[PDB]
């Protein structure tokens, strides 16, 4: 794909690492200076060293991998529960910002630098060295074997690392060491996913200030590492059976191996959507969660929480993080050769799709459902989101209507005519139409099912527009008939809108399809 | 009554001198506290 995965000019592959890049004199001196400052617990000048030359020069100042780990640990020293320690370390807050916030900002900015290789903005050697440092940090952050509930190796011999003689930064154990414990990676994931929607101030602050940004960074880095592994670590041509074995060793495979549990499908579905609006089915056992770093769940007296986030904001961020987790899972899965299945993680694409569809179709709040299905970039999430949409649609049609019509819309995204014909078939079957067997008393749940159905179809329609554009909406009579059938379902729902069971108007998707590709309600108002 | 009024005079003089001493010592202590904090920061920076 891009240069980040296919730039190996300056690499010096070794047994432990294939991305390894040797140090030059300037970078060696920078590494030595950063480690020397980190030894003295002068983290303020470490951050100042990194920030003072960020964006002000053509050449790039590369963060060493052990300094990256130090920054990862620093990002866990949030002010709301570590204010006295941070004030003691830096009594003269010359930057007017917490060490945690500065370290996290540097991590995210360097991740942004790494995600796109601007060979014109930065020379290629610095970018490759930065990639090597980040990959070394990730390889040091390999999860331990999942638990229900080796010290430090420096590849560079040119300098002594600061992490060799220490394991805590400011009373917080190093993030790699904390997560290289049997049941802490899954614990961290469940903790952040549960507290992403908490209304308790300490738990929400723990999720919002520490763990969601760190999880974002870690997932992005693991995705990049997975791409590099698939590009280089594998042996290109393969008997399709050794490739599965190599994929079982992939960084995402080890990442999700700490999430295997007993049954990956259902437990994973509960894990990703933990503390969501869906009703818990089959009385699944509650997942214990504990703070990762001592008193994360307490607010120190000196700190005064003076920030308020609306429920939409929190739900949007939490659902985006959940989408990232699911997308990493599907990114690992889609490389599995057909017929074969992974050895170490007992994961199947169909099982995960069905589980996510079961959890999505069980949402009783439409806001979280839409937040999950509303994405700002369609191309980025294009490889799994349509599958989840079609699966949730199929399950909703299954529970609402006794006759389950097989949906081929995903491969019908290739041909708009086929997609429109299938939409016509579903709506004429009245499965997409509002169902008469639903009683007056249970009208609200039927409305919920229909509005979720409309959301799923809208997602598939946006993807169809993304793959074919707007060319034959009226030129092909099939799409015109699809629009008229949407109007027919509009009339069908309006029948009960006039039946006056509730004052609230039922969900009608004609205006939305009109705005997207209905040509503003066809010729109702245009002509 | 003369002895008691002289007693009040000496009592008020001792009271005023005690408050003068208390202000002097409190001012010295506050100045020393601020100076100690500044010196601690200076020494930490120099040592680093």
Query: What is the full DSSP assignment across A3-38?
Result: TTTS--SSB---SS-SS-B---HHHHHHHHHHHHHH
Instruction: Kindly determine whether residue A40 and residue B48, on different chains, have CB atoms separated by under 8 Å.
Output: yes
Question: How far, in Å, CA of A10 to CA of A239, rounded?
Answer: 30
Question: How far, in Å, CA of A264 to CA of A252, rounded?
Answer: 15
Smallest CA-to-CA distance from A273 within A220, A210, A327, A318 is with A318
Closest chain B residue by Cα to residue A38: B48
Instruction: Kindly determine whether residue A92 and residue B41, on different chains, have CB atoms separated by under 8 Å.
Output: yes
Q: Which residues contact A64 (CB under 8 A, 6 or more apart)?
A: A31, A34, A35, A133, A161
Helix (H) / strand (E) element for A123: namely none
What is the DSSP secondary structure assignment for residue A229, as one 8-state letter?
I
CA torsion sign for A338, A344, A348, A349 is negative
Inform me whether the C-beta atom of residue B48 falls under 8 Å from chain A C-beta atoms: yes
Q: Rounded to a whole number, what is the distance in Å from the CA of B43 to chain A's nearest CA?
A: 13
Question: How far, in Å, CA of A390 to CA of A382, rounded?
Answer: 13
| Closest in A40, A45, A91 to B41, CB measured | A91
Question: How far, in Å, CA of A132 to CA of A27, rounded?
Answer: 13
Inform me whether the C-beta atom of residue B46 falls under 8 Å from chain A C-beta atoms: no
Closest chain A residue by Cα to residue B37: A91
Instruction: Kindly determine whether residue A92 and residue B48, on different chains, have CB atoms separated by under 8 Å.
Output: no
Q: Quick one: how many helices (H) and strands (E) in chain B?
A: 1, 0
Inform me whether the C-beta atom of residue B34 falls under 8 Å from chain A C-beta atoms: no
Residue from A92, A93, A94 whose CB has the most chain B CBs within 10 Å, to mutate: A92
Q: Rounded to a whole number, what is the distance in Å from the CA of A113 to chain B's nearest CA?
A: 31
Q: Which residues contact A368 (CB under 8 A, 6 or more apart)?
A: A276, A277, A315, A319
Inform me whether the C-beta atom of residue B41 falls under 8 Å from chain A C-beta atoms: yes
Provide the token pair at A158.
């040119």
Residues 31-50, chain A, touching B (beta carbon < 8 A): 40, 42, 45
What is the DSSP secondary structure assignment for residue A168, as one 8-state letter?
B
Question: How far, in Å, CA of A193 to CA of A196, rounded?
Answer: 5
Which residues on chain A are in Cβ contact (under 8 Å) with B43?
Answer: none
Residue from A44, A48, A91 whose CB has the most chain B CBs within 10 Å, to mutate: A91
Question: How far, in Å, CA of A382 to CA of A378, rounded?
Answer: 6
Q: Rounded to a whole number, what is the distance in Å from the CA of B48 to chain A's nearest CA?
A: 6
Q: How far is CA A269 from the centre of its chain?
A: 14
Question: How far, in Å, CA of A368 to CA of A355, rounded?
Answer: 17
What is the DSSP secondary structure assignment for residue A143, as one 8-state letter?
P
What is the DSSP secondary structure assignment for residue A351, as one 8-state letter?
H
Exposed, middle or buried, A148 (CB in 10 Å: 0-12/13-18/19+)? exposed
Question: How far, in Å, CA of A62 to CA of A295, rounded?
Answer: 33
Experimental method: cryo-EM
Question: How far, in Å, CA of A510 to CA of A371, rounded?
Answer: 21
Q: Rounded to a whole number, what is the distance in Å from the CA of A4 to chain B's nearest CA?
A: 38
Q: Which residues contact A223 (CB under 8 A, 6 or more apart)?
A: A252, A328, A331
The Cα-based distances of A254 to A122, A225, A307 in angstroms read: 32, 12, 37
Q: Rounded to a whole number, what is the distance in Å from the CA of A249 to chain B's nearest CA?
A: 44
| Closest in B37, B41, B48 to A42, CB measured | B48
Q: How far is CA A464 from the centre of its chain?
A: 23
Resolution in A: 5.6
CA torsion sign for A5, A7, A11, A13 is positive
* Number of other CB atoms surrounding residue A186 within 10 Å: 23
Smallest CA-to-CA distance from A410 within A483, A361, A353, A368 is with A353
CA torsion sign for A425, A426, A427, A431 is positive
Q: Quick one: how many helices (H) and strands (E) in chain A?
A: 22, 0
């Amino acid at each position: 794909d891009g240069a980040l995965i296919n730039s190996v000019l300056y690499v010096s592959p070794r047994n432990g690492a294939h991305y390894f890049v040797e140090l030059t004199e300037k970078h060696l001196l920078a590494f030595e200076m950063l480690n020397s400052m980190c030894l003295l617990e002068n983290y303020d000048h470490v951050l100042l060293f990194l920030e003072c030359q960020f964006g002000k020069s053509h050449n790039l100042a590369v963060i060493p991998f052990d300094i990256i780990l130090v920054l990862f640990t620093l990002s866990t020293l949030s002010e709301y529960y570590k204010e006295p320690i941070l004030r003691a370390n830096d009594p003269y807050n010359t930057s007017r910002e917490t060490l945690s916030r500065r370290a996290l900002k540097l991590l995210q900015k360097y991740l942004a630098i790494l995600k796109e290789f601007d060979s014109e903005q930065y020379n290629l050697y610095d970018l490759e060295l930065l990639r090597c440092q980040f990959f070394l940090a990730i390889d040091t952050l390999t999860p331990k074997k999942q638990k229900w509930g080796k010290t430090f190796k420096n590849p560079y011999r040119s300098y002594i690392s600061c992490l060799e003689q220490r394991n805590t930064i400011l009373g917080n154990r190093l993030l790699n060491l904390k997560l290289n414990e049997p049941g802490e990676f899954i614990n961290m994931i469940l903790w952040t996913l549960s507290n992403s929607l908490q209304e308790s101030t300490p738990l929400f602050l723990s999720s919002h200030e520490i763990w969601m940004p760190l999880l974002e960074i870690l997932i992005d880095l693991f995705s990049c590492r997975q791409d590099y592994f698939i590009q280089h670590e594998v042996a290109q041509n393969v008997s399709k059976s050794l490739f599965v074995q190599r994929l079982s060793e992939s960084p995402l495979a080890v990442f999700f191996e700490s999430l295997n549990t007993r049954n990956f499908a259902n437990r994973f579905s509960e894990y990703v959507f933990l503390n969501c609006d869906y009703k818990l089915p089959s009385d699944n056992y509650a997942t214990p969660v504990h703070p990762v770093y001592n008193g994360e769940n307490t607010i120190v007296d000196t700190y005064i929480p003076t920030i308020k986030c609306s429920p939409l904001y929190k739900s949007q961020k939490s659902l985006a993080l959940r989408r990232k987790l699911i997308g990493s899972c599907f990114k690992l899965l889609l490389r599995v050769p057909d017929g074969h299945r992974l050895i170490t993680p007992r994961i199947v694409a169909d099982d995960v799709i069905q589980g996510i569809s079961r959890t999505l179709a069980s949402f009783n709040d439409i806001l979280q459902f839409k937040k999950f299905f509303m994405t700002e970039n369609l191309s980025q999430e294009s490889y799994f989101i349509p599958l989840l949409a079609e699966g949730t649609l199929s399950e909703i049609l299954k529970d609402t209507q006794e006759c389950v019509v097989i949906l081929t819309l995903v491969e019908n995204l290739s041909d708009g005519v086929s997609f429109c014909n299938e939409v016509i078939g579903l709506v004429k079957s009245k499965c997409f139409a509002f169902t008469e067997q639903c009683s007056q008393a249970s009208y609200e749940e039927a409305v919920l099912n229909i509005e979720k159905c409309d959301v799923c179809l809208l997602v598939l329609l946006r993807y169809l527009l993304h793959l074919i554009g707007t060319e034959a909406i009226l030129d092909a009579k099939e799409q015109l008939e699809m629009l008229h059938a949407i109007e027919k379902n509009d009339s069908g729902r309006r029948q009960w809108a006039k039946a006056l069971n509730l004052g609230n108007d039922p969900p009608l998707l004609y205006p939305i399809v009109s705005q997207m590709f209905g040509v503003h309600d066809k010729s109702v108002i245009i002509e | 009554q003369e002895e008691v009024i002289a007693l009040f005079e000496k009592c008020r003089n001792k009271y005023k001198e005690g408050q003068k001493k208390y202000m002097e010592i409190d001012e010295a202590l506050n100045r020393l506290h601020n100076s100690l904090k500044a010196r601690d920061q200076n020494y930490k920076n120099a040592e680093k």
